[model samples]
Target: GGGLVQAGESLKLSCAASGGFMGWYRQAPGKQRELVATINSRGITNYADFVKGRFTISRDNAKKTVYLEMNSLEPEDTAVYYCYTHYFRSYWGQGTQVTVSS
Candidate 1:
């Protein structure tokens, strides 16, 4: 009943909520995974400045949901999207795939 998303006026990326704290990461095949950002249960968000203004992380404590929004969409933003529970690799949602197109 909950999902996370990255949206613009025309494009939206949504990730179904699994459980626990929600987090975002960047992963490429045969490469190291990097923590892109995170949002705590209280809705506190943290991101690297390079991606700061372009992205947003939000949470709904009541619904146990979390979301991500990225504006000014670009092809470079294309990647696998995941929802995680806390800092541990305990739980995860089936990755969301994003492809930027005209």
Candidate 2:
């Protein structure tokens, strides 16, 4: 009934079903797009070290849904969330608007 999310108690990301493979990435205002991680039907996951503890990927193979979670929300974590179909280039969500402010 739930979705995949980062393994933390801070922030979380959710991916909608009716899409292709779940490819998660992070992109700053003027920085390059960083591959935060990926998830498949078998629950297999791969994440970068910088995003390991703070990031997570999950999916509901049945519902064709996916999700991401990021804990300890920080200013640096403020970026757009995307769901890609291909490796390098792909479609994306509406983009998660995250503004970290005290």
Candidate 3:
């Protein structure tokens, strides 16, 4: 899924899956993909320093879904986002294109 948002807005992206570990990643145009955050099977969440205080991760076991909430959108935030799960192997959701406009 994808959407366009004005600068300074917020957006939430989600993925549905049952897994060992869940993670979020983003890739800016012309840049390499970077890990955003991860949640362990134990339900503990860890986020990269750059995302802390602005990006949060949540999940609903009954719904079998995990979410990535990003605040304070900026043009620099435009990118393709992806949800990832890892058990015996790794699986990724179709990327979500997020375009942040001024």
**Position 48, candidate 2: lDDT:** 76
Q: What global local distance difference test value does model 2 have?
A: 0.68
What TM-score goes with each of the models?
Answer: 0.58, 0.64, 0.77
Cα RMSD for candidates in order? 18.0, 17.4, 17.3
Shift of residue 46 alpha carbon in model 1, Å: 0.3
Regions of candidate 2 where Cα sits further than 4 Å from its true position: 1-9, 18-21, 87-102
Tell me the lDDT of model 2 at 46: 86
- lDDT by candidate, in order shown: 0.62, 0.68, 0.85
Question: Of the candidates shown, which would achieve the greatest lDDT relative to the real structure?
Answer: 3
Candidate 1 lDDT over residue span 19-54, tens digit each: 445677866566666666687755677885557477
What total of clashing residue pairs does each candidate reach? 1, 3, 0
Sorted on TM-score, best first, the list reads: 3, 2, 1
**Order of models, best lDDT first:** 3, 2, 1
lDDT of 3 by residue, 1-102 (tens): 689999878998998854678899889988999888898878899987777578888888888789988998788778899998766866899999999999
Error of 1 at 3 (Å): 15
